[PDB]
Every structure is written in C-alpha cells, then in structure tokens.
Design a protein around this ligand. Structure first.
Ligand SMILES: CC(C)CCC[C@@H](C)[C@H]1CC[C@H]2[C@@H]3CC=C4C[C@@H](OC(=O)CCC(=O)O)CC[C@]4(C)[C@H]3CC[C@]12C
Ligand SMILES: CC(C)CCC[C@@H](C)[C@H]1CC[C@H]2[C@@H]3CC=C4C[C@@H](OC(=O)CCC(=O)O)CC[C@]4(C)[C@H]3CC[C@]12C
Ligand SMILES: CC(C)CCC[C@@H](C)[C@H]1CC[C@H]2[C@@H]3CC=C4C[C@@H](OC(=O)CCC(=O)O)CC[C@]4(C)[C@H]3CC[C@]12C
Ligand SMILES: CC(C)CCC[C@@H](C)[C@H]1CC[C@H]2[C@@H]3CC=C4C[C@@H](OC(=O)CCC(=O)O)CC[C@]4(C)[C@H]3CC[C@]12C
Ligand SMILES: CC(C)CCC[C@@H](C)[C@H]1CC[C@H]2[C@@H]3CC=C4C[C@@H](OC(=O)CCC(=O)O)CC[C@]4(C)[C@H]3CC[C@]12C
Ligand SMILES: [Ca+2]
Ligand SMILES: [Ca+2]
Lengths: 870, 100, 61, 180, 50
C-alpha cells in the first residue's frame, strides 16, 4: 500500500504470516482497544500515557495492535510509533474491519466530503482488514499468549497487555472475551466511557447506579433487554479483578505506565497456580521493570521460600542492567557482598559489562595525566582483563561508569566510607578533566561534588564527637585501599571544601604548633626566641628559624653586594657560597620528597633559577677581567630580586598576609589587561608624537627612548616637559646624531619649530587624560571587583595551600576501638540518610490515603448490615 | 461560572435542543466555561464529525478564546486543513486590526 | 592572506518536542500544592455515607 | 594535505590576520620615523599595498552586508582610517614643504586610528574580551567627570586672571593660561 | 513606541518566547548535541529568512 503492507482476512496461521514472511518475534505486546472513536479527546494526560507507552514498548520491542484508521488515538499512536522508529523496534499493526474503509482498492495506492467511513492510518506499517457480509483480533491475543518462548522469564508466554480507555459495546465485548481468554491483563484508565465505569466499580442494581453517570446518552437509545446484557458483561468483567488494573487520575506521576503494565503482568503471573511456587520468575519479571515496592511487598514480605543463595544470579543482572534500588533491596534482605564478589564475578564485571569506552578513556589517562592512584587501579582492572578488599573494587566499577544512584548504594557497604568518598572524588575528577564529552563531563564533576560534600558532612559528624578519634582517621592508610591516607587523598584531588572545613583547619593548626600548648599568644613565642629542646621541635619554630636564617642570608647577600665584592672573593663572600649551597641542598631535598609535582609548582621553579643565576654569577665573576667581572656583579644584583621575592612566598602562612598574597595572584589578569591597553596607547601616542622630529638613522634605538620610554614616564607624571612649545633649541638636542641627546625639532627657513602645536598639545592632553586617569583609575575598579568576587573563594584556596606549608616539616635537620567508634557513628549516619526521605513528609497526601482506607470499610459495613434487616 | 451553568442547565433539558449540540457549544463559547464544554459536550463521543467544528473554531479565534482553541485541537481539528487560503483572507482583512 | 580575499533529525526532535509539550500541559496539574482538590475528594463519600443510612432508614420502618 | 587543513580553522585565520596587522603597524611605524623622505621610497609603496588590502577587506564587509555594516560603530572608524590615509597621499604628493610636512602629520594622526583598531580586534580573547566591552560602559562615567572638570577648569582659570590684565592677549594666550 | 502598557507587555511576551526557546535548546543539547547543533543551521523549509 501507498498513501506499508496489508491483507484482507476472513473471520494461528495469521501469526505464521506476520513472523515468517514479515517482521520479528516479540518480547511484549500492548493492545489499545478502540477504533470506533473517530472523535477522541486527546487530553494531555491521555497524550502523556500513550507517548510513554511506546517508549516503554521500544525498550522491549513490542507489537501494538490498534484500530488502524486515521482518526483519534490510532492517528496519535502511529505518529509516535513513526517518530520513535526513525530516531529493538515497535511495530504498530492496525486491525480494521474493511466495511468501514472509505476507498477500497484491490502496489495499490490509497486515498465524498462527509463520509461515515474511515480513512486508513498512514503510519501503521502492517494492516489487517477483517471481512464480513474484533473476532480475529482477540483470537490473535489468545494464540500469542499461548505461544511458548523458551528464552523468557515470564514462563515464556509472550506478555500481553490490553489497554482499555474508550467506551461502547465494541470494547465492553472486547474486555469480556479478553478476560474469558486466559492472561489478557486488561488495563483500564480513568478517562473514557466504559473505562470510567470499570474504574469506579473496583450488585446488578449497583452497577446501573454507575454507567448512567458515565454513559447517560446511550442507554436511552438502548433497549431494556440489552442494558441487562450490558450489566451481564460487567458482571463477568468485575468477577476476576486480578486481570484488571486501573491508571487513576490522582496518580499523575512519572512511570505510571510501567507501574500499570508490570502490575498487570505480575497479577496475571502470581495467579497461574503453578508459577505461584515459582518466586524466581516473579523476581526476574519484577526486575526488568523498575517496580521496587511490588518486589518488596509481594516477594520478600512473607519469609516464604528463599535461601539468599539463589539471590546471586538476580543480583548480577541487577548490577549490569542499572537497577540501583534493587541492589539495595537485595542487600536489605540478606546478601553477603564480600562473598558474592568472588574473583570470577569481578572478572565477568571487568571484561564484559565494564564498557570499553570508559576503558579507552582510561587509556587516554595513561599518557595525558599520570597520577599515583590511577596507576593503582590500572593493574587491578587489567588483572581481571588478563583472565584484596573486593567490595571497594565494585565501588570503583560503578563510579567509573558514572552510575550515580548505584554507587551511592555500594558506598554504604564499605568499611572505610569516610575514606572512599574522597577516592571516588579523585577518580571522578580525573575523568571530568579528560574532556571529550560535555554532559558526561558536567555530570561526572557533579557526582564528584556529591561525594565531596558527602565526606564533608561525615567528618563534621566525626569531629563533633571525640576529635582525637576523628583526627586519628586522617592518618590511617586503612588496610592500603588507596595509596595515601584520608587527608592526603583530598589533597591530590584538590577537595578544597574538605580542607576549608573547621575540623581539618583545627587539626592543621595543632600539627603546626606542634608540642607547644596551643593558643598561648603569638607574641610570647617570639619573646621566647630535655624540655627546653622539645620546644625546638614544633614546625612553627622550624619555620621561624628558616625565616631568620633566610633574612640573615639576604642581609649577608646585601652586605656582600654593596660594601664587599672586591676582585677576589673575600672571606664573607665564601660564607655566601655556603648559604646558597644550603638552599641548593634544600631544593635537592624537595626533588627527593617529590619527583615531578615539585616541578608542577610554579614557585619551585623560580627558586631553582635563583640558584642557577647564582652559579652563573660565580662563573662570570671568576674571570679576572673587568669586561666580565663587572657583569658578574650585575647577575648577582639581578639575582637579589629573585631571592628577595621568595620572602613573599614564604609568608603565605601568616593568616594575615596569607590570604592576601594568594589574592595577589588573581590580579594578574586585571594587570595584563591594563598593560595591554597601556602598551597600545603608548605606541599609538609615541609614534604619533614623531610628527615633530624627522631623521633617518636614529641610532635604531633613539626611537625607544622617545616612542616607548618617554610616554612610559608620562603615566607617573612627566607630561612632555619641554618639547611641546615655547622651548627652543637652546639645549637637549643635536641636529646631527651626536651626542646622545634626542635630536631636534624639524625646522624651517625661519628656523621655527615646524610642529603645529594646535595638534601636539591636545594629543598629549588626551594621552595624559587616558593613561593617567581614564586608565589607572579603571584598574582600581577592576581590582575592586576582584576582591569583591574571589574573597570567599580565596579563603578556601589559602586554607588549601596551608596544608603544603605544614606538610613541609639548621643543616643538622637536612644532614580496634577507633574502628568500633566509627562503626557506631557511621551506622547512625546511614540510618539518618535512608529515613530522611521518609522524614521529609511535607505533604499529607500520604495521610490523605490513610483517611479513605476506612471510608470503604464504613460503607461496606453498612452494606453488610443492609443484608441483615432484609 | 454561575450564569452560564444556569443557562446551560436550562438549555440541555428542553428535550428538543438536547439533540442540538451545536447550540450548546456556541452558548458555552461566549462565556469562558471550558470545563463545562469539555465534560458535557465532548465526553460522550455522541454526535459530531469534527467537520462542523470549523465555524465554532473561527469564532473561537477572533473572540479571543485561547482555551477553546486548545479544546478544539485536543478533540480533533486539522489546523493545516482548517487554515485554507480563504480563512486566512477572512483573518487578515477583517479581524486583523488596522491599528496593528 | 590576499589569496583568501582574491528525516532522522526531524524525527528526533518530534519525539523530544512531544515530551516537552506533555511536560508543559501537565505541570499545571503536577503543581498540586494544595489538598483542597483532595478535600473535594474526601466529602464525595460522606454524602454517600449519609444517603446509604437514609436508605437503610426506610428498610427498618 | 593534513598540514594544510590546519590552516583552515578561523582561529588560525584570525591569528594570521593579527600577525599581518601588527607587521602592518610595524611597517607603518618604520616608514613614519626612519623612512618618509621627499619622494615615496621603496618600503613606503608596500605600505600603499597594505592599506589597499585593508581597503579591499572593507569593500568585502560592504559586500557581505549592505547597511548593517554601517550600523556598526567600529566599522566607521576603520573607513576614516583609510580616508585619512588616502588624504595623506594627497597632501604628500605636492613637492612643497608647506604641504609635504602636513602630509606626514596626517599619516601620524592616522597611526592612532590604526593602532586603536588593535583594541577592537582583541575582543575575542576570552580574557581581554569582556573587559574591552566593559570599557564601552565607562563612557558615561567619563563624560560626567569631564563635564565637572571642564566647568571647574573654566571657573578657576578665568578667576585665575585676577592677576594679569591686558586687552589683546593674542586671542589665544587665554587658552594657554585659562584652559591649558 | 506609541503606547506604554502595550509596549511593556509586548516586550514581556518577547521575553517569554525567548526563555521558551532557551529551555527548548538546553533540552535539545542535553540529548545528542550534534543533532542539537544541526538544528541551528536549518532554514527549516524557508519559514523565515535565516
Ligand atoms: C635588608 C633586608 C634584607 C632586611 C629585611 C627587612 C624585611 C624584608 C624584613 C625584616 C622585618 C620583617 C617583618 C617583621 C614582622 C612581621 C609580622 C608578621 O605578621 C604576623 O606576625 C601576624 C600576627 C601579628 O600581627 O603579629 C608577618 C611578617 C612581618 C611583617 C616581617 C616581614 C619582612 C620583614 C619586613
Ligand atoms: C635583625 C633581624 C634578624 C631581626 C628581625 C626579627 C624577625 C626575623 C623575626 C621577629 C618577628 C618574626 C615573625 C613573628 C610571627 C610571624 C607570623 C607566623 O605566622 C603565624 O601563623 C602565627 C601568627 C598568627 O597566626 O597570627 C609565621 C612566622 C612569622 C612570620 C615570624 C618570622 C620572623 C620574624 C619576622
Ligand atoms: C575638554 C577638556 C577637558 C580638555 C582640554 C583641552 C585643552 C587641554 C586643549 C584643547 C585645545 C587646546 C589649544 C588649541 C590650540 C592653541 C594655539 C597654539 O598656538 C598656535 O598654534 C598659534 C596659532 C595662531 O594663533 O596663529 C598653542 C596651544 C593652544 C593655546 C591649545 C591650548 C590647550 C588646549 C586648550
Ligand atoms: C610597535 C608596535 C606596532 C608593535 C606592536 C606591539 C604590541 C601592540 C603587540 C605585540 C605583542 C602583543 C601581545 C602578545 C601576547 C597577547 C596575549 C593574548 O592573550 C591570550 O592569549 C589569552 C590566553 C593567555 O593567557 O595566553 C592577548 C593579546 C596579547 C596581549 C598581545 C597584545 C598586543 C601586543 C602587545
Ligand atoms: C614580532 C611579532 C610579529 C611577534 C609577536 C607575536 C604575536 C604577533 C603573536 C604571538 C602570540 C599571539 C596571540 C596568542 C593567543 C591570542 C588569544 C586568542 O584568543 C583566544 O580565544 C584563545 C585563547 C583563550 O581562549 O584563552 C586570539 C589570538 C591571540 C590574540 C594571538 C594573536 C597574535 C599573537 C599576539
Ligand atoms: Ca622550595
Ligand atoms: Ca571591519
């Protein structure tokens, strides 16, 4: 056909046509009983249900049996089937009646203005046309439900659901012959004519109390002998309510279709009276769909028949198919995760279900960003790929593949959960830094910021209890899960919220003050500058006697450079050669306490060229030639700046200068913008300032004395001191090119200055306005916004680098119960998490459900007393 | 919502205009009673063709009935078929305000 | 530099736009911050309770 | 042809229009200071080619758009950058020092307009970029400041002449002492 | 601008349909982005000019 395939049938072998010649066998079958609805109210709720239905049907690969014509819901079903097939597969078979089709032809194309017949729907790719002079559809329901598939967990049987929403005799008959057939699983909705009747009924006269509020205008057209037959059908329909499921109006939530399909498929699976003993099939059925509250209440709340030993095959498929609430349900009902995670189960988890898109993204990290924990997991993931705390190995598996809700479940089963919330933030911040995606990068950084805040509220709860117990957790290697302890693992991943918290900041202050009784006064220790020797063990004093040594190094380097420094290296100059060797040896030690993160630090580069220019200074000095001996002193002079600007970086500990020096490293983008504007304005003004002078040689470098240097002094105030008029050729200029004075203004036959002076004077006054006022004062505003914006961030940054300065710790210097305490407190934490979702409770709509539970009991008890009087 | 409900309850019970769903729709279109026009006229699938839903659609546009334009499209109305070259001509010459 | 001088995509949007227009026209119903609609659903049976007791009042007498 | 497909991205086409423009300004610098003799020399003609390229690149912006090109403010300044340049060649080619020197002054005043195009070129840089557009919001704070400063200059500068007293004052010794 | 409340409401509806197009595209972009970036290049059967 052209506007698909069709066939003109007659009222088993139909299914032989649709499969062996046509399309694939199905693991699902949804059937929407309608078709007389040429008019259909496509409300947004009825639009929501049948759009989520075909998305559900595309996950399993169903057939959809509809009415098949071009009106109402079948037009909408075909439109959502067609858009989902292009972008497993849904086939939308239509079953029409061939006497109601408009323009019958007998590759035929298909095309009165008010005809009562029906146009065929364009987007039903396979149509069935029943001949006459509803029956074969319901017989095709009964044959497919009896069709046996061996590769299923429904017991086979090809799960068939019937969706009832409309009204009329043609569907009310089609619910009876559905229900008279075994396994129809008819699902009704709270919007329609007949489907609102059967929704309300879940007596012969009590039925007719309904269906006149819902169908008032078809019974007046009906005979009295037929409305009892209509009552007789709904008698048989309401006889077996384990095949009827309702989608109520009040449940306008999410997943309302899969909570209605799977509930209907479970109610017709638990009542077969040979599969009610089979709890395994009812669990695997309830695992494909996400119905958790049905799997808990109907399978686990009897203690009927399981051993928690065949709960393992359903656990492995709950991990790899992303069932995070069912992993939690199997652990609540008893499952030893340290016993389930054998060496084989992790091998089947790291070779098959561990996605190689992640594994090639870890292949990127083997050259791009070489870390220390990443090389710990590369031997472990390739251990099983080449085919020990294994519960944390499952946590690595789930956090690498960005499984957010599953990793929160496995995190609660670890023995160090205070630790592993940071190591997951380290692995995730590696993957969010390797950026090939955007939404996957923006979500992997989010989960890294969930587990960081999860570790923060853990430690503040750890620290509000016994703090010496809490501070002892930060030092444990914890049976060598990671490389380092809980404290350093936040440092390698730069978890700045975890170190800006007051627990660690109070810990680092205790470790920095050392054996000194903390909070004496900062002044009194300086007044004090084997009990006398233990004062000189704290790193606060070792820092101070490295400042006093460094200042006295600079004072010697001052006195050598100015008053000393004769032709041969004198007595005090050699002591300076010892003190630079000490600072060379102290940088050898920083090349020995670290390998290459020492070079990753910026300020640990400057102090190397501080020594490298110093040892270059001794090379230029020892030549006994004043052409080179003086240039030895210049290198030592230029080296004094680099050694004195190390006194800035040493005082980033001081708690007062400390935040402000790190604040100073944020202004360098405001300065480089200002220097860019100033340099362009200098060259634009300085070259245009040479509409005054005119020569050809200019030394090649008298230009830079006047184009660059002279507008540079104008920023600090110079203002063209005596070139801009009424300053004649009395001095300062040459006319020739010798001497080094800048050459004269171009002159005339009158020997007058040629420059117009109505141009050069407002040119300087524009330049002096811009770069001295419209520019510098601008820099204050861009400085003033920076201290307004990064101030609350600079505290976390300074508290972060405060760790490394405490971590760093005079030539004699160079050359059970705690686990039980956490186990109680972690248990009260995991309790507090998994009930706070229930302690939210901000709506009484759950209590509204508890109210009406007795109003049915009240009216039913009055119905029972109504039989006793009569 | 009380005037039009009273005017509809004495219009649907005349026993000669209960067959006339067209008059009950044009009555419910002057007043803004949308929930009565959905529940009492469209929720039976009783008698319409969605082909004489066009004259009530054109008066639902020009009299600013935004919830009734939505109600006619929910209950089946091909807007690409309703918008002929003539209907847009009657929409751009007459009801398109010349102040605009 | 002077040499310089001298179907499936529409189907993909149609699914996602449909989930958007669904999400609009039900979020007015998913607001639901007042149980005054549920208050209306409570008293729908209290008339049925008193009326069923009125019907049993005719059976004893 | 993999080495050539590197030189197809517009990031590199932007960079080789900056390097061309900076070397245009460095030539325009060297011509203006050390060169620029009485007749237009060898390197000065290469400058006449490079301004024709920037003229042709503004013809193209008059061809990729009709009148929204003129609606842009910075696409006006670079036209008078060329218009003052072609006026500079007119004042130069006169062989008269009464006019040949004023040809160099126009080329000097044109160097500001070409160098202040390097501000608007670097509005892409993601660091200078927001700050250069921020600079176009200060022009109402500046024009208020220049208004207060100019009224205070005239009020003080004229009242500063309760010192001197004469009748001619060149008509322009006033502005050397009242304003300047 | 010849009116004030009609001007202040026509700019409001222009800022409704702009935020309506913003949340459409962030939903477009949180799905397949190369599909989302291909929408920005279509003339779309020449409804508008561009
Ligand atoms: C010729 C050169 C080599 C001599 C070196 C002179 C300065 C570079 C030195 C000597 C005195 C030093 C200061 C002496 C006192 C302190 C206070 C200290 O701040 C605090 O102690 C915070 C708590 C408090 O307020 O006391 C920070 C460093 C600082 C400013 C020192 C900074 C560097 C200084 C200025
Ligand atoms: C002639 C010269 C050798 C004498 C100059 C004396 C300084 C070399 C001494 C006296 C004051 C000292 C400082 C006093 C206290 C500070 C702040 C201190 O930082 C703190 O965190 C403690 C203060 C606080 O937390 O408020 C680190 C050492 C430091 C810089 C000390 C470094 C060395 C200083 C400058
Ligand atoms: C808007 C405000 C904030 C900026 C201030 C601008 C002044 C600093 C500038 C603009 C015009 C300048 C004047 C323009 C040209 C003259 C004539 C010039 O002398 C000549 O050229 C002689 C010509 C002749 O009279 O024949 C000396 C400088 C002077 C007074 C300038 C003095 C300083 C002035 C006032
Ligand atoms: C005599 C005249 C004609 C010579 C021209 C000198 C300057 C006007 C030029 C040459 C060097 C240029 C700068 C060289 C490096 C860059 C960095 C660039 O910023 C970034 O790349 C942002 C990312 C980063 O931080 O690297 C912005 C332009 C800028 C400042 C350039 C701005 C203009 C400059 C100062
Ligand atoms: C003797 C002269 C010719 C050599 C001077 C070298 C410059 C002409 C070159 C070297 C650095 C270049 C810049 C390096 C990177 C920047 C920023 C770039 O803007 C960006 O968005 C990328 C940077 C970022 O996004 O952080 C645009 C080009 C630009 C200005 C480049 C323009 C031309 C520059 C200044
Ligand atoms: Ca160091
Ligand atoms: Ca331009």
């Amino acid at each position: 056909i052209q506007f698909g395939k069709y066939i003109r049938l007659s009222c088993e072998t139909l299914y032989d046509l649709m499969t062996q010649h046509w399309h694939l066998k199905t693991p699902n079958l949804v059937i929407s009983v309608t078709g007389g609805a040429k008019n259909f109210a496509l409300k947004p709720r009825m639009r929501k249900i049948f759009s989520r239905l075909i998305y559900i049907a595309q996950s399993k690969g169903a057939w959809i049996f509809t009415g098949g014509t071009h009106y109402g819901l079948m037009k909408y079903i075909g439109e959502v089937v067609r858009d989902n097939t292009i972008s497993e597969n849904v086939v939308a078979i239509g079953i029409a009646a061939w006497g109601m089709i408009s323009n019958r032809e007998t590759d035929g194309s298909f095309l009165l203005k008010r005809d009562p017949l029906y146009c065929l729907d364009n987007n039903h790719t396979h149509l069935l046309l029943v001949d006459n002079g509803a029956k074969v559809r319901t017989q095709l329901e009964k044959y497919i439900s009896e069709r046996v598939i061996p590769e299923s967990n429904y017991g086979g049987k090809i799960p068939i659901v019937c969706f009832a929403q409309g009204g009329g005799k043609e569907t009310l008959k089609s619910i009876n012959v559905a229900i008279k057939s075994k396994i129809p699983c008819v699902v009704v909705e709270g919007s329609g004519r007949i489907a609102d009747v059967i929704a309300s009924l879940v007596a012969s006269s009590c039925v007719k109390e309904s269906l006149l509020r819902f169908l008032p205008r078809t019974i007046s057209r009906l005979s009295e002998e037929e409305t009892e037959s209509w009552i007789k059908w709904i008698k048989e329909v309401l006889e077996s309510p384990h095949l009827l499921t309702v989608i109520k109006i009040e449940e306008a939530g999410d997943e309302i279709v899969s909570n209605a399909i799977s509930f209907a498929l479970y109610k017709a699976f638990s009542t077969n009276e040979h599969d009610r003993d089979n709890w395994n099939g009812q669990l695997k059925l309830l695992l494909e769909w996400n119905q958790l509250d049905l799997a808990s209440d109907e399978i686990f709340t009897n203690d009927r028949n399981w051993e928690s030993a065949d709960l393992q095959d359903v656990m492995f498929t709950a991990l790899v198919k992303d069932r995070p609430k069912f992993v939690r349900l199997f652990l609540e009902n008893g499952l030893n995760l340290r016993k389930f995670l054998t060496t084989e189960v992790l091998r089947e988890l790291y070779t098959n279900n561990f996605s190689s898109l992640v594994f090639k993204n870890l292949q990127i990290a083997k050259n791009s960003y070489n870390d220390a924990l990443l090389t710990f997991v590369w031997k472990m993931v390739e251990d099983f790929r080449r085919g020990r705390h294994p519960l944390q190995a499952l946590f690595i598996w789930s956090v690498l593949q960005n499984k957010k809700e599953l990793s929160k479940v496995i995190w609660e089963q670890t023995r160090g959960c205070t630790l592993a919330a940071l190591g997951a933030s380290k692995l995730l911040k590696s993957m969010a830094k390797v950026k090939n995606d955007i939404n996957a990068a923006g979500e992997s950084e989010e989960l890294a910021n969930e587990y960081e805040t999860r570790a923060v509220e853990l430690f503040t709860e750890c620290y509000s209890n016994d703090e010496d117990l809490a501070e002892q957790l930060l030092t444990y290697s914890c049976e060598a899960w990671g490389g380092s302890n809980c404290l350093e693992l936040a440092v390698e991943a730069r978890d700045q919220q975890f170190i800006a918290q007051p627990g660690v900041q109070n810990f680092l202050s205790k470790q920095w003050y050392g054996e000194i009784s903390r909070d004496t006064k900062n002044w009194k220790i300086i007044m004090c500058l084997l009990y006398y020797v233990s004062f000189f063990t704290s790193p606060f004093v070792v820092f101070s006697w490295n400042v006093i040594f460094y200042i006295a190094f600079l004072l010697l380097f001052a006195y050598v450079l100015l008053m000393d420094f004769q032709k041969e290296p004198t007595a005090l100059e050699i002591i300076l050669y010892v003190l630079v060797f000490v600072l060379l040896c102290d940088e050898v030690r920083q090349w020995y306490m670290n390998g290459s993160k020492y070079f990753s630090d910026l300020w640990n580069v400057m102090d190397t060229l501080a020594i490298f220019y110093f040892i270059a200074g001794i090379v230029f000095r020892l030549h006994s030639d004043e052409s080179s001996w003086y240039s030895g002193r210049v290198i030592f002079c230029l080296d004094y700046i680099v050694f004195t600007l190390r006194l800035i970086h040493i005082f980033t500990v001081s708690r007062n200068l400390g935040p402000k020096i790190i604040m100073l490293q944020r202004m360098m983008i405001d300065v480089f913008f200002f220097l860019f504007l100033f340099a362009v304005w200098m060259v634009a003004f300085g070259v245009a300032r040479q509409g005054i002078l005119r020569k050809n040689e200019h030394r090649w470098e008298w230009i830079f004395r006047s184009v660059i240097y002279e507008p540079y002094l104008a920023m600090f105030g110079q203002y063209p001191d005596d070139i801009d008029g009424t300053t004649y050729n009395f001095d300062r200029c040459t006319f020739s090119g010798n001497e080094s004075k800048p050459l004269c203004v171009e002159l005339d036959a009158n020997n007058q200055p040629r420059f117009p002076e109505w141009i050069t004077i407002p040119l300087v006054c524009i330049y002096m306005l811009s770069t001295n006022i419209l520019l510098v004062n601008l820099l204050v505003a861009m400085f003033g916004y920076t201290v307004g914006s990064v101030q609350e961030n600079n505290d976390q940054v300074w508290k972060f680098q405060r760790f490394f300065l405490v971590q760093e710790y005079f030539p004699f210097v160079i050359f059970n119960e705690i686990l039980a305490w956490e186990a109680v407190m972690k248990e009260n934490y995991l309790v507090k998490i998994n009930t706070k979702a229930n302690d939210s409770s901000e709506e009484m709509v759950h209590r509204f459900r508890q109210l009406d539970a007795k109003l049915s009991d009240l009216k039913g008890l009055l119905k029972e007393i109504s039989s006793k009087i009569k």
